[PDB]
């Protein structure tokens, strides 16, 4: 229900994180998706995002590739093998 999405310079990450709860509710508590538990994954560049559901990963999962305010964007499925590389 995870996935990783990547390759932004860290200055776009809000802007990124807010064009994918387009896809479902996000589950982490990131400040910009933040209204008035799962641990916050993220690097230089990369982020995991879960949702609630697999209907909402399987469309995020089809943003790959996608140019977003001039940057290619990847999305893949989340891996713990991937993650634990990144770290």
Do not use: C, H
Request: charged share 15%; hydrophobic share 45%; glycine share 6%.
């Amino acid at each position: 229900l995870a996935i990783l999405v990547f390759g932004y310079p860290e200055t776009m990450a809000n802007q990124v994180i807010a064009y994918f709860q387009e896809f479902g509710t996000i589950l982490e508590d990131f400040e910009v998706l933040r209204k008035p538990f799962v641990p916050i994954f993220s690097g230089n560049s990369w982020t995991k995002i879960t949702y609630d559901n697999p209907a909402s990963a399987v469309d995020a999962l089809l943003e790959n590739g996608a140019v977003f305010n001039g940057v290619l964007l990847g999305v893949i499925p989340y891996t713990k093998d991937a993650v634990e590389r990144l770290q």
